[PDB]
Amino acid sequence: METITYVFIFACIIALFFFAIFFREPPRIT
Amino acid sequence: PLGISGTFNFMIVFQAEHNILMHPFHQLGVAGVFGGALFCAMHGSLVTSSLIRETTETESANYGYKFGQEEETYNIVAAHGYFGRLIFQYASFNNSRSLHFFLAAWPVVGVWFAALGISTMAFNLNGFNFNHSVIDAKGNVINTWADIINRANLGMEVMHERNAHNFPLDLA
Amino acid sequence: MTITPSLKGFFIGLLSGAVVLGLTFAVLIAISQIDKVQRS
Amino acid sequence: ARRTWLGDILRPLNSEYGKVAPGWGTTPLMAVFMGLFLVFLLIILEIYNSTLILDGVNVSWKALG
Amino acid sequence: ERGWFDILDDWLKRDRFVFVGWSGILLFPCAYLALGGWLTGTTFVTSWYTHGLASSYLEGCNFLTVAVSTPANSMGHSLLLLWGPEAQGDFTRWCQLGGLWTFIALHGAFGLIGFMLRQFEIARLVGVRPYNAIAFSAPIAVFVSVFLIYPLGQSSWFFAPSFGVAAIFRFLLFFQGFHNWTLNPFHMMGVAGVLGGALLCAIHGATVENTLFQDGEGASTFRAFNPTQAEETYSMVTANRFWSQIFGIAFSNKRWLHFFMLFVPVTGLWMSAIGVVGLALNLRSYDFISQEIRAAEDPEFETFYTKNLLLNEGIRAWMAPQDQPHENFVFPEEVLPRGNAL
Amino acid sequence: ESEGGRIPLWIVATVAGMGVIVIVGLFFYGAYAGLGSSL
Amino acid sequence: SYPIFTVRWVAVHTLAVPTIFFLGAIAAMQFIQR
Amino acid sequence: DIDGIREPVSGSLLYGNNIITGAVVPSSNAIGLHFYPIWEAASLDEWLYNGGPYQLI
Amino acid sequence: GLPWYRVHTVLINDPGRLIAAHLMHTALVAGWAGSMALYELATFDPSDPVLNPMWRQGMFVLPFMARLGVTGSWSGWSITGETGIDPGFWSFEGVALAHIVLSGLLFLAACWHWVYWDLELFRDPRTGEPALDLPKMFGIHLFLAGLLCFGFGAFHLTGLFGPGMWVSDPYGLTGSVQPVAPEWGPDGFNPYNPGGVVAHHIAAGIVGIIAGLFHILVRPPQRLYKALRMGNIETVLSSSIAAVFFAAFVVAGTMWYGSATTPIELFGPTRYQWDSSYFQQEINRRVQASLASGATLEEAWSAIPEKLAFYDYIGNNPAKGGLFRTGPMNKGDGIAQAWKGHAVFRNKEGEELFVRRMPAFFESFPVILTDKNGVVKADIPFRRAESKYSFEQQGVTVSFYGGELNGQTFTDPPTVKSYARKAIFGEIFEFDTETLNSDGIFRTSPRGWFTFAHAVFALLFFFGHIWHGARTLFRDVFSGIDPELSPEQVEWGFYQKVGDVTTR
Amino acid sequence: MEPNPNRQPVELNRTSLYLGLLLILVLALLFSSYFFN
Amino acid sequence: TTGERPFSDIITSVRYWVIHSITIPALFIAGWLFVSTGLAYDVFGTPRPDSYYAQEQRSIPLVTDRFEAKQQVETFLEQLK
Numbered sequence A: 001m002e003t004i005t006y007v008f009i010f011a012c013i014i015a016l017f018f019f020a021i022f023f024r025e026p027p028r029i030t
Numbered sequence B: 001p002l003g004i005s006g007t008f009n010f011m012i013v014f015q016a017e018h019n020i021l022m023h024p025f026h027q028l029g030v031a032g033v034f035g036g037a038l039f040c041a042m043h044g045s046l047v048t049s050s051l052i053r054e055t056t057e058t059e060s061a062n063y064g065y066k067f068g069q070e071e072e073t074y075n076i077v078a079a080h081g082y083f084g085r086l087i088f089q090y091a092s093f094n095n096s097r098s099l100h101f102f103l104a105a106w107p108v109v110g111v112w113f114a115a116l117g118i119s120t121m122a123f124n125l126n127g128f129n130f131n132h133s134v135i136d137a138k139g140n141v142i143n144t145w146a147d148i149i150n151r152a153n154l155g156m157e158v159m160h161e162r163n164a165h166n167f168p169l170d171l172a
Numbered sequence C: 001m002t003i004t005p006s007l008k009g010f011f012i013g014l015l016s017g018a019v020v021l022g023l024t025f026a027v028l029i030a031i032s033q034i035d036k037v038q039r040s
Numbered sequence D: 001a002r003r004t005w006l007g008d009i010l011r012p013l014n015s016e017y018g019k020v021a022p023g024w025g026t027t028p029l030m031a032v033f034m035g036l037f038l039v040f041l042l043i044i045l046e047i048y049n050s051t052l053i054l055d056g057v058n059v060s061w062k063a064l065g
Numbered sequence E: 001e002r003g004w005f006d007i008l009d010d011w012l013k014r015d016r017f018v019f020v021g022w023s024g025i026l027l028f029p030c031a032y033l034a035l036g037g038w039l040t041g042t043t044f045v046t047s048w049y050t051h052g053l054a055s056s057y058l059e060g061c062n063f064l065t066v067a068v069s070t071p072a073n074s075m076g077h078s079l080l081l082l083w084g085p086e087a088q089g090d091f092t093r094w095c096q097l098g099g100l101w102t103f104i105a106l107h108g109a110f111g112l113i114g115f116m117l118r119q120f121e122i123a124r125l126v127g128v129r130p131y132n133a134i135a136f137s138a139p140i141a142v143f144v145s146v147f148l149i150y151p152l153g154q155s156s157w158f159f160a161p162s163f164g165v166a167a168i169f170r171f172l173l174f175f176q177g178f179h180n181w182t183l184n185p186f187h188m189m190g191v192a193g194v195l196g197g198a199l200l201c202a203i204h205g206a207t208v209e210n211t212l213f214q215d216g217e218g219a220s221t222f223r224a225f226n227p228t229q230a231e232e233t234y235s236m237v238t239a240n241r242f243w244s245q246i247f248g249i250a251f252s253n254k255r256w257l258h259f260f261m262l263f264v265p266v267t268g269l270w271m272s273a274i275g276v277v278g279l280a281l282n283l284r285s286y287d288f289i290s291q292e293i294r295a296a297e298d299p300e301f302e303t304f305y306t307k308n309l310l311l312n313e314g315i316r317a318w319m320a321p322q323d324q325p326h327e328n329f330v331f332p333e334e335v336l337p338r339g340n341a342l
Numbered sequence F: 001e002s003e004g005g006r007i008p009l010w011i012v013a014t015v016a017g018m019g020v021i022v023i024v025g026l027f028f029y030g031a032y033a034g035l036g037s038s039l
Numbered sequence G: 001s002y003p004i005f006t007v008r009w010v011a012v013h014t015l016a017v018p019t020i021f022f023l024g025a026i027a028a029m030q031f032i033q034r
Numbered sequence H: 001d002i003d004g005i006r007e008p009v010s011g012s013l014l015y016g017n018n019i020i021t022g023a024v025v026p027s028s029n030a031i032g033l034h035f036y037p038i039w040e041a042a043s044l045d046e047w048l049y050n051g052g053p054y055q056l057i
Numbered sequence I: 001g002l003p004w005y006r007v008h009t010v011l012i013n014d015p016g017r018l019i020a021a022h023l024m025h026t027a028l029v030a031g032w033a034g035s036m037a038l039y040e041l042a043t044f045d046p047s048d049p050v051l052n053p054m055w056r057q058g059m060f061v062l063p064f065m066a067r068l069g070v071t072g073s074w075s076g077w078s079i080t081g082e083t084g085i086d087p088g089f090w091s092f093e094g095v096a097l098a099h100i101v102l103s104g105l106l107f108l109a110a111c112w113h114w115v116y117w118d119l120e121l122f123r124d125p126r127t128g129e130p131a132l133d134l135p136k137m138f139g140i141h142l143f144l145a146g147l148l149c150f151g152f153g154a155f156h157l158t159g160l161f162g163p164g165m166w167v168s169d170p171y172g173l174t175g176s177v178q179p180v181a182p183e184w185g186p187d188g189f190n191p192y193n194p195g196g197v198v199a200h201h202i203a204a205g206i207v208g209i210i211a212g213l214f215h216i217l218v219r220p221p222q223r224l225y226k227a228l229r230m231g232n233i234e235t236v237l238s239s240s241i242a243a244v245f246f247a248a249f250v251v252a253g254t255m256w257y258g259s260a261t262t263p264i265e266l267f268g269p270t271r272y273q274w275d276s277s278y279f280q281q282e283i284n285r286r287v288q289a290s291l292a293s294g295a296t297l298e299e300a301w302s303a304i305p306e307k308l309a310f311y312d313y314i315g316n317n318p319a320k321g322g323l324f325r326t327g328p329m330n331k332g333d334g335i336a337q338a339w340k341g342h343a344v345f346r347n348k349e350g351e352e353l354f355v356r357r358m359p360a361f362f363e364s365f366p367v368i369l370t371d372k373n374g375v376v377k378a379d380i381p382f383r384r385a386e387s388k389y390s391f392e393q394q395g396v397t398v399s400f401y402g403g404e405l406n407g408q409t410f411t412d413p414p415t416v417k418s419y420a421r422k423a424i425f426g427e428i429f430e431f432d433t434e435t436l437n438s439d440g441i442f443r444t445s446p447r448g449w450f451t452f453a454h455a456v457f458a459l460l461f462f463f464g465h466i467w468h469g470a471r472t473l474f475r476d477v478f479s480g481i482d483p484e485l486s487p488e489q490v491e492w493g494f495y496q497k498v499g500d501v502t503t504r
Numbered sequence J: 001m002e003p004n005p006n007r008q009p010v011e012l013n014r015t016s017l018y019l020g021l022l023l024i025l026v027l028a029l030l031f032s033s034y035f036f037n
Numbered sequence K: 001t002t003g004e005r006p007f008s009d010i011i012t013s014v015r016y017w018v019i020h021s022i023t024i025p026a027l028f029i030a031g032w033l034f035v036s037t038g039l040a041y042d043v044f045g046t047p048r049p050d051s052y053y054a055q056e057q058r059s060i061p062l063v064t065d066r067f068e069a070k071q072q073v074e075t076f077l078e079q080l081k
């Protein structure tokens, strides 16, 4: 259970990186 | 080691073996990161202090800046007016370029000395050794805080890798 | 009265602090009054 | 806004918003109380710290006992 | 209306080389005495009677080894006032008992309050927001936690940090060996805020300097800035593209960026302070119970965590007799923990 | 008499700087001799 | 044209006067032998 | 076996570590500065005992 | 819209909803206290106040109930170990039920104050704008606080109309709830004198009534009203948070050092009692009085109360815990069952030897035995090859006086060493480690946990004070600085007085 | 009742979601070892 | 500009150096003699090299009584001679 929990959190962080990069709010100039 | 506790092990053994705390390059490194943190907070606080009113109380001040706007978003004259009075005038930067260069240089140079500390203790030029440097009129050793450090270091030295040494000196 | 040596010390500390602060304020007030800001 | 029986009774207690006495008013009297309070705190602090030691005042579990 | 208070207020707030203010009345004496006490002690004053140590230039120490050392453990948490029951007005005895330590710690504490009041007072006068004062709450929380709260939870001021370069190093190593402080997640958050802050300092300074607009003909580019100019001196749009492409994300909002630069190191310091408050009570992150259960039962089970505790046990046994002289420890050679040969 | 500029600033800097080097040097000398020398 | 005794003057000398006295003291210390 | 004394140190989560104790453990003192790619080991089991992942990483 | 960290700002100009939110916080807190008390009652074992008191069991609210006179359960037991006691309604259970009912009533009042927010009472009669007259509110509330404080002191603590408060002897052996008379002399400021807690409440209460009346009847000076922004409710938040961090540091300190309001029977002993061998010295005193009166050594040691011996054990020192070592002290060393008796070590020459005790700093400590003069006579060696003080070499034996092992002597080295290892912790106890699957690792008491939480929250509230104080005094620039800020206001020398345009 | 004029909409932008999720996930990664002990 | 004379004017003036060519060496010499005369040891209670231990003693004179600490230090000092 411990190992699963660590790996799960890490894998969520990795997914977050993906969304934060590729599915960011695009920066728009005025 | 590639790990959190492993990192601490490396640090404690390095201290035992090189007295890194007493090495001026690690000291420069500390000045580099404590100072980088200080100046980071200082820069952040001073620019944040001086943001120009562009928003109301029920919105984030962040909406007062638009990506790519031409006009600066804080008043550097006000920030300098502040900081120059906090200390005295000529201790504060009124040139943004000079400020931002200092912000780069301080941590970078300090961390280069940190790196060079490790890279030169790699060839066992170690921290300052003032073990028994203070002696009384008879020749009794009068400890200083260096000697207390030394006792801690000895603890680390004698316990580390407890089954690996067969001979009296740890030469590498 | 039962004034122990440490109560006497306490009074000495209190008096000393009051003198330091008293003199500090006396001097600052005096200077402020001598050297006034020019106004509208 | 809604009137109620109790709100009517209490009305005067929330009717002087902004009301002030002129200039410095009682500020000097306040300052005297604040100084006396600073000294009170210092006394109790120094008693607890054993910097001020008074007859009949044993700062220990063996106080009473 | 035009009274002495207002006249004094005028004088205190004149625009002069060194601003004074109302805050100055607290800040200047306290800062001067803390600094002066440190210089006085490191230059002339021993730690023989409190620690069994030489600690001054006078006795032969150098800049790295001098210190104003804490009072003896037997003083407990005495304020150690010059006119107090220990020194009884005798300046020499006061120095020998460690009175300069509480002198420096307490004038230093009030001095810091004065400095933060100054930050507020000046901000108010110039008409800026008081975020610099807000940020300085971190140094205050560190000073108060380490120099006051920590020893107050312990037996005495003896165990606070002594004011000295080597003395502070000893304090770090004490915390490793006795508290396993590296293991503490509050210290780890500290580390991340300090190193993160240093990172942000470096990277923001370098980014601005490398996205500058050409605003002059000079190859040395500092003169091409005017404090009063309206326009940004560097390109946020180019900076943003660069980092988006190198690292994947980038700042797009300058107000956010500079707020984050406050938040990171300030939050880190505040976390480290919380940990030290726990260490005041020996409430450590010393152990992982699961690790210890396994290792006790299985003599083949070894991690870097177990290795570090062996180091800690060495530190404690080898340093305690000289570092804690009031305990009169005598540890026979035969009890000292040692590995093979060394 | 007290006219600013009579002693050039580059000379003041050089002499002051040399003074700093001398006193700091004395301090390093002292690390090897007398108290604190280990001898 | 300029005053001599200012807050700045006081601040400078509160540091500078002791600093030179101290540097003289520490200089002398370099000649102390056990 | 970080120290080359046949005293293996556990670094991985599945072998009893948490995030704080875990590590990829340095290659063996027996190896020293020798280059220890996968293909210098007789097997992955040996490669693993001797701390081959460290060098690769 | 509003950022997440500002959502509650909607209440700043809405007194009715502010009252509602305050009511809901108060409901939550009182619900907590009721729930906490219920959980404690469902886990607390009242069967052994001597070796299994509340502070060994992770009890946090139980001791607060007991400090003020709640000592009995409806089930018939009392925390002093009495049976067949009738506590009336105000048992631990009745207090818990009262808190839960209170919670409910407060929740309902919140609902009403939320719905019916727009009351005329909350409007300034001159402007029609929402307004609170905070200076007069302060007077009203201070007067109330004073009445209550006075009443608590004069009726509850004295026993004149109420139960009194927990008091004990200097060694925490005979504690009970008693009426306490005020101490009006200087010893009233001794933190360890209960009579001063009474005199405090009586006197501060009277001061609060008087100052309350003042604050109701006399308006603030204009100069103070403007300086402290007394029209802005956030100034009250700033100063209130300051008062609260002060109070929180004070209760952390008095919990850590001990006082008449942090008694050791409720919270556990202090670290300082171990440091100074407070209990050991008294035990030794008692034994020596017994020997002088003509008792045998067995008799003398047998006369020591188990409860006294148990305080002279480092497992009860609150500075021996860990931040993530969770739960009751019993989860570590186990549930204490019995004193083994006093261990006397002797070498083959028959000299008494003394085990060096573990200081609280140390997670582990060597085993070293000295004669009465501090000379080393025996140890457990680490390296054996040059050992000269081993128990085998020195023929170290251990004999027990008092407790379960009274009259017994052990000579086999493994057993004598085992007892020496335990003697570093002070007096030796038999523990039940099975019932809770105890892991053998020390945990702190409620004295420790309370001190930690309060010191931490105190320090965090300092940031709260700074922050809300800043927001108050800088309200005008909190969306940013003057877009029209003249360079002259920040240019050196343009104004004689910084920021004063009348001084060009 | 007549509506309350003190109501304000609340916002959390995407970047703030991501920052917040990172904070929470990394805090959990850090504190989880201690919670398991 | 805040009203005071520029430092660079001051330290390049002859009158500054007439004054400070006296006061600076005077202070430095006074500090020197504070040590060389032994006065520093007496003011601050710092042991001279011959005053850490009595001739045959190898025990640190540690203060162990808070309220008698002054007298303990005094007794330690008596033990030297």
Ligand code: CLA
Binding pocket: C011, C012, C013, C014, C015, C016, C017, C018, C020, D035, D036, D038, D039, D042, E025, E026, E027, E029, E030, E033, E079, E080, E081, E082, E083, E099, E102, E103, E104, E106, E107, E110
């Ligand atoms: C803002 C300036 C300032 C502040 C905040 C402090 C603060 C402090 N100093 Mg420092 N100090 C200062 C300036 C300051 N100092 C200056 C300028 C000097 C050089 C003279 C010193 C020299 C000095 C020494 C030598 C020592 C201290 C010490 C102290 C501490 C204890 C002070 C105390 O108990 O006072 C108590 C007094 C007051 C708080 C004043 C209260 C005044 C009230 C409000 C008025 C009532 C007075 C009353 C009428 C008197 C009648 C008594 C009568 C019945 C006999 C405290 C940290 C001690 C220390 O650090 O020990 C470790 C110590 O030994 N200080």
Ligand code: CLA
Binding pocket: E267, I039, I040, I043, I057, I058, I059, I060, I323, I324, I325, I326, I327, I328, I445, I446, I449, I450, I451, I453, I454, J027, J031
């Ligand atoms: C002042 C608050 C306080 C204190 C001092 C105590 C004290 C105690 N409680 Mg109680 N309790 C409390 C509040 C408190 N409680 C509350 C609010 C609840 C409801 C949740 C409980 C419910 C409760 C239960 C169910 C039990 C206890 C028990 C206990 C005992 C064991 C405590 C323990 O193991 O802590 C362990 C403490 C920690 C591990 C420290 C946690 C530190 C956190 C995780 C830090 C968070 C960091 C943060 C995320 C970082 C932000 C960073 C960001 C800003 C950048 C002890 C007497 C136990 C007992 O023995 O009962 C008989 C027990 O079973 N209590």
Ligand code: CLA
Binding pocket: I004, I005, I006, I007, I008, I009, I237, I241, I460, I461, I462, I463, I464, I465, I467, I468, I471
């Ligand atoms: C009586 C105490 C108290 C009160 C009534 C308030 C009230 C307020 N504060 Mg302040 N503040 C306090 C103490 C207090 N503060 C303390 C101690 C600190 C330091 C930690 C702060 C630091 C602080 C900052 C930095 C900010 C505020 C802001 C605010 C305002 C908006 C709050 C909001 O919408 O949060 C909404 C909060 C959430 C939606 C979730 C918060 C979750 C927390 C972080 C974790 C869980 C908390 C847990 C449930 C609480 C347990 C209780 C605890 C005591 C143990 C509001 C007027 C804001 C402001 O000024 O707006 C203009 C603002 O930016 N406060």
Ligand code: CLA
Binding pocket: D038, E026, E079, E106, E110, E112, E113, E116, E117, E120, E140, I228, I229, I235, I238, I239, I242, I243, I246, I465, I466, I468, I469, I470, I472, I473
């Ligand atoms: C770093 C510390 C610090 C800082 C920068 C501030 C800053 C502020 N406070 Mg806070 N405050 C503090 C600590 C601090 N506070 C402490 C420790 C308390 C006691 C609980 C308070 C209680 C407090 C209240 C009740 C109020 C403020 C207010 C304010 C604001 C206006 C300025 C003011 O009133 O200063 C106050 C002055 C000081 C902090 C300096 C005091 C110096 C003392 C008197 C020296 C004492 C020397 C001592 C006697 C020596 C003996 C020591 C002993 C150990 C021997 C500003 C945001 C006001 C506000 O928010 O307005 C909107 C407000 O109403 N503060």
Ligand SMILES: CCCCCCCCCCCCCCCC(=O)OC[C@H](COP(=O)(O)OC[C@@H](O)CO)OC(=O)CCCCCCCCCCCCCCC
Binding pocket: B101, B104, B105, B108, B109, E205, E206, E209, E210, E219, E220, E221, E222
């Ligand atoms: C031994 C120490 C060696 C370090 C030397 C290098 C220092 C500066 C480099 C930091 C880089 C940060 C990241 C890029 C940041 C960046 O982009 O900077 C850019 C910045 C300005 O760019 P410019 O184009 O205007 O000027 C550089 C050239 O184009 C020439 O005009 O560069 C400088 O200002 C250079 C200053 C050189 C002055 C000579 C070296 C001075 C030594 C300072 C250190 C003293 C050491 C004390 C140790 C105790």
Ligand SMILES: CC1=C(/C=C/C(C)=C/C=C/C(C)=C/C=C/C=C(C)/C=C/C=C(C)/C=C/C2=C(C)CCCC2(C)C)C(C)(C)CCC1
Binding pocket: E032, E033, E035, E036, E037, E038, E039, E040, F020, F024, G014, G015, G018, G019, G020, G022, G023
């Ligand atoms: C404590 C006390 C007090 C006070 C005191 C004081 C206030 C003092 C001061 C003092 C001082 C004020 C001192 C000073 C000193 C100084 C010094 C000693 C310095 C040194 C320096 C150096 C050494 C430098 C070096 C350098 C340079 C120059 C540059 C760069 C490089 C270097 C860093 C190398 C009183 C009486 C109240 C009371 C009682 C106690």
Ligand SMILES: CC1=C(/C=C/C(C)=C/C=C/C(C)=C/C=C/C=C(C)/C=C/C=C(C)/C=C/C2=C(C)CCCC2(C)C)C(C)(C)CCC1
Binding pocket: F010, F013, F014, F015, F016, F017, F018
């Ligand atoms: C200004 C300045 C400063 C200072 C500086 C200094 C202090 C400098 C010094 C300088 C110097 C002081 C220099 C010198 C030089 C010299 C030389 C360069 C020489 C040469 C010589 C030779 C080459 C010789 C040879 C010989 C031989 C080989 C043999 C025999 C003969 C003879 C001896 C001739 C400062 C940083 C503060 C600030 C900024 C500016």
Ligand SMILES: CC1=C(/C=C/C(C)=C/C=C/C(C)=C/C=C/C=C(C)/C=C/C=C(C)/C=C/C2=C(C)CCCC2(C)C)C(C)(C)CCC1
Binding pocket: I027, I028, I029, I030, I031, I032, I035, I100, I101, I102, I103, I104, I105, I107, I108
């Ligand atoms: C409605 C009503 C009722 C009922 C009511 C009830 C049944 C209530 C309950 C209530 C309750 C049952 C409440 C509770 C509460 C609780 C709370 C409020 C808690 C909190 C918690 C917290 C806040 C935590 C925190 C933390 C954690 C989690 C971990 C560690 C750290 C800390 C401590 C921070 C009746 C029938 C009377 C009728 C009338 C009406």
Ligand SMILES: CCCCCCCS[C@@H]1O[C@H](CO)[C@@H](O)[C@H](O)[C@H]1O
Binding pocket: I333, I334, I415, I418, I419, I422, I428, I429, I430, I431, I432, I433
């Ligand atoms: C004659 C018996 C030899 C063994 C001596 C046992 C030391 S005392 C022993 O200590 C344990 C903790 O380690 C407790 O859990 C247990 O209750 C207790 O009997």
Ligand code: OEX
Binding pocket: B013, B017, B160, B161, B164, B170, B171, B172, H003, H029
């Ligand atoms: O391995 Mn890792 O640490 Ca470098 O020193 Mn030799 O070797 Mn081992 O001992 Mn010490």
Ligand SMILES: [Ca+2]
Binding pocket: I437, I438
């Ligand atoms: Ca078990």
Ligand SMILES: [Cl-]
Binding pocket: B009, B013, B159, B160, B161, B162, E307, E308
């Ligand atoms: Cl190791």
Ligand SMILES: [Cl-]
Binding pocket: B164, B165, B166, B167
């Ligand atoms: Cl070897």
Ligand SMILES: [Fe+2]
Binding pocket: B043, B047, B100, E204, E208, E258
């Ligand atoms: Fe910037």
Ligand SMILES: [Mg+2]
Binding pocket: E060, F029, F030, F031, F032, F033, F034, F035, F036, F037, G029, G030, G031
């Ligand atoms: Mg020398």
Ligand SMILES: [Mg+2]
Binding pocket: B137, G033, G034
């Ligand atoms: Mg000689």
